[PDB]
Design an enzyme around this catalytic site. Structure first.
Site, PDB file in Angstrom:
ATOM      1  N   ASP B  43       0.835  -1.192   0.000  1.00  0.00           N
ATOM      2  CA  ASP B  43       0.000   0.000   0.000  1.00  0.00           C
ATOM      3  C   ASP B  43       0.874   1.248   0.000  1.00  0.00           C
ATOM      4  O   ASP B  43       1.761   1.399   0.845  1.00  0.00           O
ATOM      5  CB  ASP B  43      -0.927  -0.005   1.215  1.00  0.00           C
ATOM      6  CG  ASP B  43      -1.937   1.131   1.192  1.00  0.00           C
ATOM      7  OD1 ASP B  43      -1.986   1.877   0.191  1.00  0.00           O
ATOM      8  OD2 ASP B  43      -2.687   1.276   2.179  1.00  0.00           O
ATOM      9  N   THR B  76      -4.937   5.884  -4.552  1.00  0.00           N
ATOM     10  CA  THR B  76      -3.938   6.794  -4.000  1.00  0.00           C
ATOM     11  C   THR B  76      -2.724   6.904  -4.917  1.00  0.00           C
ATOM     12  O   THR B  76      -2.221   8.006  -5.161  1.00  0.00           O
ATOM     13  CB  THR B  76      -3.516   6.330  -2.605  1.00  0.00           C
ATOM     14  OG1 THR B  76      -4.658   6.320  -1.739  1.00  0.00           O
ATOM     15  CG2 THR B  76      -2.459   7.261  -2.028  1.00  0.00           C
ATOM     16  N   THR B  77      -2.245   5.773  -5.438  1.00  0.00           N
ATOM     17  CA  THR B  77      -1.091   5.792  -6.329  1.00  0.00           C
ATOM     18  C   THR B  77      -1.420   6.379  -7.695  1.00  0.00           C
ATOM     19  O   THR B  77      -0.507   6.812  -8.405  1.00  0.00           O
ATOM     20  CB  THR B  77      -0.530   4.378  -6.499  1.00  0.00           C
ATOM     21  OG1 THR B  77      -1.545   3.521  -7.039  1.00  0.00           O
ATOM     22  CG2 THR B  77      -0.069   3.825  -5.158  1.00  0.00           C
ATOM     23  N   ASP B 361     -13.740   2.628   3.489  1.00  0.00           N
ATOM     24  CA  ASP B 361     -13.418   2.612   2.066  1.00  0.00           C
ATOM     25  C   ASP B 361     -14.593   2.116   1.234  1.00  0.00           C
ATOM     26  O   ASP B 361     -14.700   2.455   0.050  1.00  0.00           O
ATOM     27  CB  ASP B 361     -12.184   1.747   1.815  1.00  0.00           C
ATOM     28  CG  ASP B 361     -10.915   2.369   2.363  1.00  0.00           C
ATOM     29  OD1 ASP B 361     -10.925   3.582   2.661  1.00  0.00           O
ATOM     30  OD2 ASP B 361      -9.905   1.645   2.496  1.00  0.00           O
TER      31      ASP B 361
END
Lengths: 524, 493, 507, 519
Positions: B43, B76-77, B361
């Site tokens: 993560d 996120t990435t 989430d």
């Protein structure tokens, strides 16, 4: 990435050629090993005096000789274009695309580019060889080398070309316009306004004989004799030796009767001029001046070769055999003062068209006068591209061709499926170095003239043919001006032989560099 | 120009580590700690958080990831790669080509507007009222997790949680609220140990863990009367026990004038006030937080009052269904049932902690659907479809603004490129055929993560909400213009 | 790259810095030591740059352009290099700002084109207006001789200087045709002018008190071979056992020498000149016939004798033709300077002359000779060119003044480029005040005051520090110098700034 | 260590060079910001040049003079500190070049003091009070560029004329003839009725409020009307809500109503509302009541209408409304149908000098942004018109002083001429750095701008001209030479007066230091 490091070595040479092409370019100082300063715009002199080791740069040097020998223009077009193809290829090498398929992309784009060059031809020369028609070809050649002499040297060069070039058509058997057919001389003093064009080779030797000039008769017969002027002797050896003073009277009186008898038959045949390639005796000047024969001596054997192509005379190894087949014809022989020194020139009027002419240059500075001679000599070989092998067609210059080829190649990139579309799209991007080169040398902003140039070539025409502007070039001005000029204004265009031949050389130059993944050397 | 290079170097070196962290097939990362430990998780949030950096450009990406996680739960990435590739593609223009940075910033402002228009064109409508359609959406954050078995029950807890906070209204007078929902304060979960996940229900109201001051109380009240107050009931300050017992009785008698069935005290409650209100038939709750009184006033309607003698007659116990003292999990609770309360159950504390981050989430995906009924195809479909449309608009873009514009088209292809590099296929062959696919076929054709060959999304939809694509492109332009705006580096105070 | 251009900037300043003290008649002199081990000190920029032999290619351009200045004109070789190299310093800060060098060079050619037009407007042709024939050249010679040690004796020096120029045809004049022979010792005001040519008289051989120095019309004959008995190197080897033959071989070697020696008498020439030393044998036979002979004559003086009496040089004494002889009006041998000096006088066909100078020391006369060369060029160019311009700061300040107003109408980078070129013109009057000892700060500001009042003729006074008009100072310069200086300095500067990279090959 | 001679003069220039290079990129609105990292590792970023110089670490003592210059500049003007540092940078660079010319620095300093005194008199002979405020508004370009990022920017062309003309009539005498522009005025409202194109300008303050009953007339007392501001409600008074009643209030609130009708006030404003008993009583008297008034509105109306806001009236156990004491003079109060809007229009009164603008838009979401954008826009206009004399920007002053001091240097002709020439050319760095961040070539716009002021200032002192327009500035967006007077970019003149005066004081102290002793 050794193949990438080979491109970085060319990048140092790439920046050298960015200051060469264009009238706003920079001149480089070349110091010879003999301690002589050489400054010239043409980059072929720099690559000749600098020996190259690494192959990537050496191929570009050998590719320069390919362009320089076959044509007198476009030496900077090959070095700049081939250098940019390797710079834009770094993005494909980085992504992981092998250099093998990169070559295949340029091969497919080369055939698509050469096909579009035939459609870029706007006008065509009728080969009339008129004084005004020769100005259109010579004007862009004088540019990018010498500035300010473009309009002055236009009339001086075009006058000598029409004299050595006959008017003929539909004949390809006999070649025309030899390289040696044009000679250029220079002298200190005066200016470029007083320069004149001579229809024949100018001799710098003084008229030692008492006859300064010939008469007004038409077609004066000239004779070229290699053997020196003396009493008739054996062709093999035959050296005259002196023994006693009694034989001295026979040697002096013997040469008086023999020379006078041989020269009497020459003057009766109508030969008023004798060219002696060797030394002339004292007794020879006595008889030739009484018969009205002008004495002309040419000790240099290099000048006698081009003289045979004018009047058709042939040198005679012996002496005393006035063969009529070896005799030439000259209309007028006079002696004019050039640069303060009186010299006997060679010219003709309205007869026996000459294949050799000489342009007399005059300048205040001898250093800059030598560079003008090299610029004119380089302009001679540029005329050779006007012959039968596709010399009549012309393409728009001043950066107009490289911009139009962008929209043509990028249109076929997305149309052609497969992995070749990556190299085809990048092949048209490499053409952006030509307009940027003229912009950096002229001091113009790269963020203004360059982006606004693509908007001129991109228009919406309610039809199937893009038109209404063929004239958009690159601005060469040194003063701030809104917009750019047109091709029709200054008549600045590129020849088909220069553009088409430079593409095949540039692709093969960058192919060899991409084909080398490693080098193999041995101990000397 | 030295600081402009450091902004590119510091931004790429940090973003290059997480390039392999995108996708379900993403490769693992190893971060060696100076104390001897390592991090096996892939993560991108837990990796870069423990990485100490020097150049400030890396710290700007750390605060950007924390802000982006508050909006969307995943991806996120994706934001870091997209914001880092735009700066990487502008490296030859800003440095080598000597392009002015404001020209690039001015071009990114116009490219941001055109980027949002392409996303709205390729987007597809979706029904937010369909309960079966919302299950396949949240499922993107369900599968490959421990909640895959309870997904049927997890979707019921996620959907019913936002239904209370959401308000559906529209008109041309007060404007469009765009369905504003606050997950933080109202939808905040409460983890109760014990029980079962299948028995977890969505409770509408507020919950309090404080017990009742008396062991035996009524388990249910017909008409509960809620009274809120601030000042506690105790002997005030300027034979003695007679005055202290009388002073507390007089303070409690004022509340009993309306005979309330429930008493809520913000501060502590003395033992003297507990006996007087015990015979009155009302429960007393000591130690009520001040921040809870704002949420309790909404589920009840009792007006906030400071002094015990200032209680207004408008205070009523309406809009309160029942009051239950029932104990669940050996802990006394209170049931007072625009704001709900999520009650989580499990078999241990580790189960509740796993459901916590999974449910947050899960609701983030369902929340993004409420902002607008639109969905975007995942797996690099939307990323590549925009890059194809960017090259077509370049016909009107002539002028200096066109050169920095091309850096955006090549940056959109970086997202599907990282998925192919992790898939194992040829990145040159697949991206070349994928870009030409949109020029002919439909824009909805993406890339499969498991296989790696070009396939249609009809088989496996993988439909992400538009908010993920919006915030990814919006924050990328702001992050790109953030580092290009600072051309110098000065240290010291 | 840009590093090679910056390296060429300091190379041009280093050459310019050495020529700054040499600017002006009162400027300092530079010391140059050639590899020949000969001390050479001169203020003329031509000779200065020719003896340095700088290997730097861009610095050699400043040397090559000085030879072109010496060819066409010959005056101003120092100022043309200072003006050319000054643009290197003005364009130095413009390179760091991003301004291309070609845009800077383009603005110069537009400023020079407008400057040449202003030169013709400032040039006024005047000959007989407010001036006579004799006083025209005399007033010009006293200007170059001012502020010198000869200023007190300049009254007698101008009469000899004007007569030296008038002694030659006004159509063709050359400074090399006027000879100057330094005579050590004696008074400076006692110098005289000679119509003929003189030599050093290096003859060291005895036989004096003969060959008197009073002649009427002696005939001049050139001698080649050696008339002395014993030769320099070779000899005759004769082996005889007879005593009488030992005396015969002595006269036998003399008989071959007397052959060509007697043929000199058959010519009948009283003057015998030869580049080789004449021994005591020839001067002894010539003493009875009153025939003069002098050996060890320099080759440069022999060429002036041919152009004087119309003589010729023959190898032997046999074939000498009678028309090769020549004669002067008077021949007198002067002992001035503790040495005898032969001289010719009254040659109507002489194309050259000789001016004798006297003083207290050889180093003092050397400064007088070089100070005269600056005055000769002003007198020579007065009759040759009728277009003259006011010098000494007059023209130099006005060319920079007009370019400031014309730049206000021009837009773009060329506005500050012309202003930089106009500021670059301020180095010429600067060094003139610094080399004269005057303060360059005060005069530069005070001169610009009256210069803005509308009068373009205000110059700089070289005698007493002050601002004023050089028209009363009689400072005149030809128009060809100011026109060629701006063109040569710009052409030399354009070639230096056009070099991006310097390539040097060893071998 | 002790350093003397010319060695310390070169160190002072290099020390102030790195300090001055920090604010050169931040000059102008197109300028760029930077981050300041401390030893802890944290940092911050801001576009204000004064904040960067406050946190800037200057190790050399020579550069610390510019640090104190930034603090003194903010205490007086508070704006333009970034441009002050750049001016003092070129003054130190040109003064060091004169060292090789053998020029003493005191003469260089003396030459700067003479050119400064002449530049002060030159400003008074060019600038002047604001002109061309009728028939056109030059301030419309200031608010247009600020609102260009919002939907209002499209319609801002029509809205800009409403904002500029508003503040023009807001200026009043304040206290004893101040004649200044206040910072609080022009109450902004919202209208959802129609499109933003139909927005109408209201000549005066419009109170936003509703009515109670429809029986009362909407227009009464056209000639004159007295507005009575009240706070407590006319409802029956309550003792306490916490006390239980186990067994006067109406007569107290009704007694004050008798003092209302008898006072002649036709307008009653109550913040807590009005009961129904006091309602019908106002119907027979044709008095218009208003329920639930805003407290922040009545305090501004009291000063506008001449009234006084009072929460409770007692005056030693007295009961009355204080007739004629709190009653103001209002010309007319009219209520008309606004097409889905309800407001109270106050047109005339004794003395107001106020105004109001009611914004109209599509929805409330857009009107919320139109009100916030108008605050940051007009705030710049308030500070612009606050000064009686304004100067245009864009390099007009630096170019005018360059040509003016060029001919003025001829008045000496000895020493200061070289110092004045370098002082006038030193101001050219300000317009040059503006083009760097504008991507435009600095050697073009700055050079072309100087050519325009050359011929324009020739006929100015002669008092005879045909067509002459001064104040040519720089346009950063379009990269062209435009007139700043027509563009509408203005700056307070007190800034540049204190900017050039403070920049010299920091430059003089540096050139007077021939030795630095560091123990």
């Amino acid at each position: 990435g050794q193949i990438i490091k080979s491109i970085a070595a060319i990048r140092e040479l790439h920046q050298m050629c960015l200051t060469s092409m264009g009238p706003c370019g920079r001149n480089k100082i070349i110091v010879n090993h003999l301690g002589k300063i050489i400054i010239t715009n043409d980059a072929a002199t720099m690559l000749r005096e600098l020996d190259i080791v690494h192959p990537a740069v050496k191929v570009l040097v050998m590719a320069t000789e390919q362009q320089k020998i076959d044509m007198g223009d476009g030496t900077n077009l090959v070095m700049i274009l081939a250098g940019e193809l390797l710079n834009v290829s770094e993005k494909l090498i980085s992504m992981g695309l092998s250099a093998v398929e990169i070559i295949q992309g340029y091969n497919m784009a080369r055939k698509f580019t050469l096909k579009e060059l035939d459609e870029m031809v706007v006008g065509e020369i009728t080969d009339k060889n008129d004084k005004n028609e020769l100005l259109k070809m010579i004007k862009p050649v004088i540019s990018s080398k010498k500035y300010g002499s473009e309009d002055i040297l236009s009339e001086l060069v075009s006058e000598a070309v029409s004299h050595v070039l006959p008017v003929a058509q539909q004949a390809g058997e006999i070649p025309y316009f030899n390289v040696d057919s044009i000679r250029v001389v220079k002298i200190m003093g005066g200016s470029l306004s007083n320069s004149t064009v001579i229809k024949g080779m100018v001799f710098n030797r003084e008229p030692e004989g008492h006859v300064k000039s010939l008469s007004e008769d038409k077609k004066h017969k000239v004779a070229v004799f290699t053997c020196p002027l003396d009493i008739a002797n054996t062709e093999t050896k035959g050296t005259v030796l002196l023994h006693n003073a009694q034989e001295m009277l026979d040697f002096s009186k013997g040469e008086e009767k023999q020379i006078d008898a041989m020269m009497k038959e020459i003057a009766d045949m109508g030969v008023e001029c004798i060219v002696a390639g060797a030394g002339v005796g004292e007794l020879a000047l006595h008889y030739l001046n009484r018969y009205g024969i002008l004495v002309l001596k040419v000790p240099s054997k290099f000048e006698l070769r081009r003289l045979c192509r004018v009047c058709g005379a042939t040198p005679l190894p012996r002496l005393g055999a006035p063969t009529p087949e070896e005799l030439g014809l000259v209309e007028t022989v006079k002696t004019m003062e050039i640069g303060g020194d009186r010299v006997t020139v060679f010219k003709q009027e309205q007869g026996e068209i000459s294949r050799t002419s000489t342009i007399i240059l005059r300048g205040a500075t001898q250093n800059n006068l030598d560079d003008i001679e090299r610029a004119i000599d380089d302009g001679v070989a540029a005329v050779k591209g006007l012959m039968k092998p596709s010399g009549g067609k012309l393409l728009p210059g001043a950066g107009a061709t490289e911009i139009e080829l962008i929209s043509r190649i990028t249109k076929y990139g997305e149309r052609t499926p497969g992995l070749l579309q990556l190299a085809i799209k990048q092949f048209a991007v490499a053409f952006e170095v030509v307009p940027r080169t003229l912009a950096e040398t002229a001091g113009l902003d790269v963020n203004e003239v360059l982006p606004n140039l693509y908007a001129a070539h991109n228009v919406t025409e309610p039809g199937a043919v893009k038109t209404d502007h063929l004239y958009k070039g690159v601005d060469i001005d040194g003063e701030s001006d809104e917009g750019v000029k047109d091709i029709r204004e200054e008549n600045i265009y590129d020849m088909l032989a220069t553009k088409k031949f430079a593409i095949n050389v540039a692709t093969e130059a960058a192919t060899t560099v991409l084909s080398i993944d490693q080098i193999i050397m041995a101990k000397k | 120009r030295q600081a402009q290079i450091s902004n590119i170097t510091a931004a790429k070196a940090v973003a290059d580590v997480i390039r392999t962290c995108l996708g379900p097939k993403a490769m693992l990362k190893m971060l060696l700690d100076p104390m001897g430990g390592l991090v096996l998780t892939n993560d991108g949030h837990a990796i870069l958080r423990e990485i100490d950096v020097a150049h400030p450009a890396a710290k700007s990406m750390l605060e950007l990831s924390r802000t982006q996680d508050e909006e969307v739960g995943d991806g996120t990435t994706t934001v870091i790669i997209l914001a880092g590739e735009i700066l990487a593609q502008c490296a030859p223009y800003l440095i080598e080509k000597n392009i002015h940075p404001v020209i690039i910033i001015q071009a990114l402002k116009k490219a941001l507007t055109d980027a949002l228009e392409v996303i709205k064109q390729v987007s597809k409508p979706v029904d937010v009222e369909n309960d079966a359609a919302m299950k396949k959406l949240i499922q993107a954050s369900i599968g490959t997790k421990y909640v895959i078995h309870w997904s049927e029950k997890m979707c019921e807890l996620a959907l019913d949680a936002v239904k209370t906070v959401r308000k559906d209204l529209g008109q041309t007078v007060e404007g469009e609220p765009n369905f504003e929902i606050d997950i933080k304060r109202y939808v905040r979960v409460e983890k109760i140990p014990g029980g079962d996940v299948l028995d977890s229900r969505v409770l509408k109201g507020v919950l309090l863990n404080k017990d009742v001051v008396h062991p035996k109380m009524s388990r249910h009240i017909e008409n509960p009367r809620v009274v809120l107050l601030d000042c506690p009931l105790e002997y005030k300050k300027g034979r003695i026990l007679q005055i202290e017992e009388e002073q507390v009785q007089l303070m409690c008698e004022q509340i009993l004038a309306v005979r309330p069935t429930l008493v809520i005290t913000e501060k502590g409650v003395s033992d003297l006030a507990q006996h007087y209100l015990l015979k009155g038939g009302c429960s007393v709750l000591r130690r009520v937080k001040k921040s809870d009184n704002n949420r309790i006033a909404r589920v009840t309607g009792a007006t906030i009052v400071n002094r015990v003698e200032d209680l207004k007659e408008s205070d009523v116990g309406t809009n309160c269904g029942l009051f239950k003292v029932e104990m669940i999990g050996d802990e006394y609770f209170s049931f007072l049932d625009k704001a709900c309360t999520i009650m989580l159950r499990g078999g241990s504390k580790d189960i509740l902690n796993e459901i916590d981050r999974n449910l947050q989430d899960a609701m983030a995906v369902a929340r993004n659907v409420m902002l607008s009924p639109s969905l975007s195809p995942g797996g690099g479909a939307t990323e590549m479809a925009v890059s194809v449309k960017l090259a077509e608009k370049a016909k009107q873009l002539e002028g200096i603004q066109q050169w920095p514009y091309q850096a955006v088209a090549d940056a959109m292809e970086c997202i599907p490129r990282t998925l192919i590099q992790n898939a194992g296929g040829d990145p040159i062959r697949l991206l070349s055929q994928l870009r030409a696919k949109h020029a002919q076929g439909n824009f909805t054709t993406g890339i499969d993560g498991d296989k790696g060959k070009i396939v249609d999304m009809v088989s496996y939809g993988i439909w992400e909400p538009e908010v993920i694509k919006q915030q990814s492109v919006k924050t990328a332009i702001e992050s790109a213009c953030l580092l290009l705006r600072v051309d110098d580096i000065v240290s010291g105070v | 790259g840009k590093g090679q251009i910056i390296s060429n900037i300091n190379a041009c300043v280093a050459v310019q810095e050495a020529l700054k003290p040499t600017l002006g008649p009162l400027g300092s002199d530079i010391l140059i030591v050639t590899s020949n081990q000969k001390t050479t000190i001169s203020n003329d920029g031509a000779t200065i740059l020719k003896l340095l032999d700088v290997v730097h290619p861009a610095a050699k351009t400043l040397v090559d352009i000085s030879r072109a200045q010496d060819a066409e004109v010959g005056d101003g070789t120092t100022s043309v290099t200072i003006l050319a190299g000054e643009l290197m310093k003005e364009a130095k800060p413009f390179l760091e700002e991003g301004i291309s060098s070609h845009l800077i060079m383009k603005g110069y050619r537009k400023a020079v084109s407008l400057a040449v037009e202003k030169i013709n407007e400032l040039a006024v042709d005047i000959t007989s207006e407010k001036s006579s024939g004799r006083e025209l050249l005399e007033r010009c010679a006293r200007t170059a001789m001012s502020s010198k040690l000869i200023h007190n004796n300049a009254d007698f020096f101008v009469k000899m200087c004007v007569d030296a120029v008038l002694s030659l045809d006004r159509n063709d004049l050359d400074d090399k045709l006027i000879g100057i022979k330094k005579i050590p010792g004696g008074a400076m005001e006692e110098s005289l002018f000679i119509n003929g040519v003189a030599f050093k008289k290096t003859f060291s051989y005895a036989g004096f008190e003969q060959q008197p120095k009073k002649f009427n019309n002696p005939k001049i004959l050139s001698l080649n071979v050696e008339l002395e008995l014993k030769a320099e190197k070779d000899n005759a080897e004769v082996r005889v056992e007879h005593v009488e033959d030992y005396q015969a071989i002595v006269d036998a070697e003399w008989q071959l020498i007397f052959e060509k020696l007697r043929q000199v008498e058959e010519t009948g020439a009283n003057i015998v000149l030869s580049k080789l030393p004449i021994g005591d044998l020839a001067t002894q036979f010539f003493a009875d016939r009153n025939i003069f002979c002098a050996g060890r004559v320099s080759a440069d003086d022999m060429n002036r004798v041919i152009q004087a009496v119309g003589g010729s040089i023959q190898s032997t004494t046999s074939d000498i033709k009678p028309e090769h002889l020549g004669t002067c009006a008077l021949f007198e041998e002067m002992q001035i300077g503790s040495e005898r000096y032969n001289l010719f006088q009254g040659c109507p066909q002489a194309k050259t002359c000789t001016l004798l100078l006297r003083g207290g020391a050889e180093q003092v006369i050397a400064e007088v000779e070089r100070s005269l060369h600056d005055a000769i060029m002003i007198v020579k160019r007065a009759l040759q060119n009728k277009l003259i311009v006011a010098g000494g700061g007059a023209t130099e300040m006005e060319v920079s003044k007009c370019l400031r107003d014309y730049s206000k109408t021009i837009a773009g980078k060329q506005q500050m480029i012309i202003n930089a070129f106009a500021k670059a013109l301020e180095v010429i009057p600067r060094q003139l005040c610094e080399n004269a000892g005057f303060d360059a700060i005060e005069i530069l500001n005070k001169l610009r005051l009256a210069h803005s009042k509308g009068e373009k003729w205000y110059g700089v006074v070289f005698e007493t520090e002050n601002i004023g008009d050089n028209f009363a100072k009689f400072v005149w310069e030809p128009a060809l110098v100011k026109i060629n200086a701006l063109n040569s300095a710009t052409e030399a500067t354009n070639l230096i700034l056009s070099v991006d990279e310097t390539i040097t090959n060893k071998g | 260590e002790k350093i003397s001679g010319d060695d310390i003069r070169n160190q002072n220039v290099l020390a102030t060079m790195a300090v001055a290079n920090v604010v050169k990129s931040s000059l102008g609105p197109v300028g760029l910001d930077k981050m300041l990292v401390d030893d802890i590792g944290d940092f911050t970023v801001t576009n204000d040049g004064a904040t960067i110089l406050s946190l800037l670490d200057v190790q050399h003592p020579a550069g610390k003079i510019l640090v104190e210059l930034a603090q003194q500049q903010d205490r007086e003007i508070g704006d333009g500190t970034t441009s002050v540092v750049i001016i003092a940078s070129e003054l130190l660079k040109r003064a060091n070049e004169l060292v090789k010319n053998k020029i003493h620095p005191t003469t260089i300093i003396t030459g700067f003091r003479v050119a400064l005194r002449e530049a002060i008199r030159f400003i008074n002979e060019v600038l002047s009070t604001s002109v061309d405020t009728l028939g056109k508004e030059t301030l419309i370009n200031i608010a247009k560029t600020s609102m260009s990022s919002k939907i209002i920017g499209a319609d801002s062309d029509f809205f800009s004329n409403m904002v500029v003309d508003a503040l023009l009539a807001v200026k009043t005498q304040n206290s004893k003839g101040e004649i200044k522009y206040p910072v609080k005025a022009v109450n902004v409202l919202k209208a959802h009725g129609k499109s933003a194109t139909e927005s109408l300008l209201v000549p005066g303050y419009a109170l936003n409020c509703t009515v109670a009953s429809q029986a009362m007339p909407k227009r009464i007392a056209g000639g004159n009307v007295k507005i009575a501001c009240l706070d407590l409600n006319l409802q029956k008074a309550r003792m306490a809500m916490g006390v239980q009643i186990n067994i006067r209030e109406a007569g107290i609130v009704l007694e004050r109503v008798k003092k209302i009708i008898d006072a002649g006030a036709q307008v009653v404003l109550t913040t807590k509302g009005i009961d129904d008993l006091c309602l019908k009583e106002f119907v027979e008297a044709k008095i218009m009541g208003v329920r639930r008034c805003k407290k922040e509105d009545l305090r501004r109306i009291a000063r506008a209408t001449g009234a006084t806001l009072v929460s409770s009236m007692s005056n030693l156990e007295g009961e009355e409304t204080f007739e004629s004491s709190y009653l103001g003079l209002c010309d007319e109060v009219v209520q008309a149908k606004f097409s889905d809007d309800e407001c109270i229009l106050i047109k005339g009164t004794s003395k107001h000098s106020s105004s109001s603008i009611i914004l109209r838009g599509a929805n409330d979401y857009s009107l919320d942004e139109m009100e916030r954008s108008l605050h940051d826009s007009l705030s710049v206009v308030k500070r612009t018109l606050e000064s009686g004399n304004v100067v245009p920007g864009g390099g007009c002053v630096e170019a005018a002083l360059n040509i003016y001091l060029d001919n003025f240097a001829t008045t000496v002709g000895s020493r200061e001429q070289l110092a004045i020439a370098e002082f006038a050319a030193a101001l050219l760095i300000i317009p040059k750095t503006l083009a760097v961040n504008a991507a435009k070539d600095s050697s073009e716009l700055v050079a072309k701008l100087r050519s325009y002021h050359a011929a324009s200032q020739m006929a100015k002192p002669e008092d005879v001209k045909r067509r002459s327009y001064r104040n040519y500035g720089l346009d950063l967006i379009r990269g062209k030479i435009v007139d700043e007077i027509h563009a509408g970019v203005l700056e307070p003149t007190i800034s540049k007066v204190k900017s050039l005066k403070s920049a010299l004081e920091a430059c003089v102290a540096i050139l007077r230091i021939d030795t630095m002793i560091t123990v």
